[PDB]
Design a protein around this ligand. Sequence first.
Ligand SMILES: [Mg+2]
Ligand SMILES: [Mg+2]
Ligand SMILES: [Mg+2]
Ligand SMILES: [Mg+2]
Ligand SMILES: [Mg+2]
Ligand SMILES: [Mg+2]
Ligand SMILES: [Mg+2]
Ligand SMILES: [Mg+2]
Ligand SMILES: [Mg+2]
Ligand SMILES: [Mg+2]
Ligand SMILES: [Zn+2]
Lengths: 107, 63, 170, 50, 190
Amino acid sequence: GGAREKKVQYFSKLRELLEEYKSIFVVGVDNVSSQQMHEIRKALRGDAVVLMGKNTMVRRAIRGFLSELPEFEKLLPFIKGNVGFIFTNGDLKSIRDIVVSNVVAAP
Amino acid sequence: NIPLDEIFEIARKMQHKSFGKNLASVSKEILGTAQSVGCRVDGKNPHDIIDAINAGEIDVPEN
Amino acid sequence: RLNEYQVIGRNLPTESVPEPKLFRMRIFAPNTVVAKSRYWYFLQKLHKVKKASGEIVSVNIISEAKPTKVKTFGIWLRYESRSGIHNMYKEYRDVTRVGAVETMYQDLAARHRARFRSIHILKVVELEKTDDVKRQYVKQFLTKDLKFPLPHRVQKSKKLFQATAPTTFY
Amino acid sequence: IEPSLKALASKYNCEKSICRKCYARLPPRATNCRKRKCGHTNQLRPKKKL
Amino acid sequence: MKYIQTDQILDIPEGVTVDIKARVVKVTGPRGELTKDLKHIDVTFNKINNRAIKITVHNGDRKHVAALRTVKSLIANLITGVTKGYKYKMRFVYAHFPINVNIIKKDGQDYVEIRNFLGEKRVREVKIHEGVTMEISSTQKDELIVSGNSLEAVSQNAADIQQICRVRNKDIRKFLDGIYVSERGTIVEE
RNA sequence: GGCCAUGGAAGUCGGAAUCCGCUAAGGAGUGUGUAACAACUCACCGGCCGAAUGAACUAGCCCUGAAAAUGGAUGGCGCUCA
Ligand SMILES: [Mg+2]
Ligand SMILES: [Mg+2]
Ligand SMILES: [Mg+2]
Ligand SMILES: [Mg+2]
Ligand SMILES: [Mg+2]
Ligand SMILES: [Mg+2]
Ligand SMILES: [Mg+2]
Ligand SMILES: [Mg+2]
Ligand SMILES: [Mg+2]
Ligand SMILES: [Mg+2]
Ligand SMILES: [Zn+2]
């Protein structure tokens, strides 16, 4: 098994706080350095969460979780392509304010 | 040894390193290279102080 | 050209044991003289019995149940090479259990130089499910609506000379 | 030679593997020698550099 | 293993009309026509539609199966030769002696004339293949552009030019002089 | 720009080390490049296509291993789904 441990582990914290936090939204990124991310995290120690991982697996583990929190019932056909995960519990105005920036964009 | 209480200051001193979720991870990181050469690090070599601290030895919640 | 035989034998009865257990083997042999010989060859590989201390009780041909139904057979083998002794498993398409075994002997003769004397047939099984087929070279003939031509036909002539140009259409 | 052109030249003259038995000049990623005289050996080693 | 049947699918773009009869492929496109005889291979062709062609090998062994996708790739190269063209760019590599390259015409034939290669008094001449266009790049210093519809002729002429500029009796790791293919693309950029 | 060596070595000259933290991802680093950085490339994790894939081993025919002297012998011709 080996990886399946870390596999189901990625499916552990995958939820837990899921119900705790409020309805999140899109989190798209591309060509993002590791330092970039790392710093964004600091800006969110308790402000939010910085979850990341693959695309298909992320579905599967939760794609069937339509038994514990069915709620979604369809809140899944949205992870398309390069997709991360940033949690939160506040308001929309206090969202992009505590991310964005940290830009290295260029030609 | 030289763990003392003043190494927890090097944490807040170099509190610009490992963003480690909790500040104690600064110490953890600080210690993480403390074995680089290996010295009198708590009268021993790291990976036995550090690793154990993460495993849960005493307790240093440090605010 | 082979047939499948059911050979049944037993140890000779003694005053201690007057009805020894009857043992049957399925033997693929060209005739009944070799069928009873192969039986004793394999019993002495397993049991404390001899032809001198034993008795052949019955020899019967086992005919194919549906000789005009196309089947796929799996054959488990144990053969001796020039260097060692090996177990193998192979698959064949044929309509009779005997005709698959005839192909097997030709097949291990051709690809491994394994003579008849070097081969033990462990088991011949007809594969009921299409998922039971493990080998590619026979699974490719289990596809739906299988069609293929036969290009480059060579015609055998009764005469030495033909006055018209040869052709290979077909 | 400018470094851009020296890498282009090195792609054809230097970035190679060598057969240990017959000295054939092989692609760096080759697993066997292409020559029949050595038996398509896997005993290769990178072409040495200055 | 004698695979029962193996298939490859050619794709014909909109302006291209492939035309196959007795293993002689004639591909027609906006840029022209190219033909190739494949009588040394046993393959069969089926026209799926005006934009697709099935290429089949029946009951072929491992090597004869290996010869099928190469047919696919050659015909695809023909298609892109008559719809996009081919372009190889060569850079002139020398440490000390500049290479004097001219496009000459002798005996009614076009030639590539290499002079002063590594200081040699020898004048190297490479015949320019039919259907192959040479040009001295104006936008780049020490660049040769080899272009044409046929990939085989263009790459082989380029190889002729590269091979005639080989270094003898020296350490070629140190004496890196020569003419090398630097860019392999198409006339129509994508 | 880890420690020590070092004129300099900052991962990519050389020695004790092979850790920590964020991580899903990253080695105190697999290379090209520098006096040295930088720089790019990898290790691993990502997006993408979507059905198969990798490793070790066994034995058949073929190839290499396989160099001697007049020209020359599966008996000869010749033979390649033989
Ligand atoms: Mg995933
Ligand atoms: Mg067979
Ligand atoms: Mg005629
Ligand atoms: Mg070596
Ligand atoms: Mg030499
Ligand atoms: Mg010399
Ligand atoms: Mg064998
Ligand atoms: Mg000899
Ligand atoms: Mg002689
Ligand atoms: Mg002979
Ligand atoms: Zn070799």
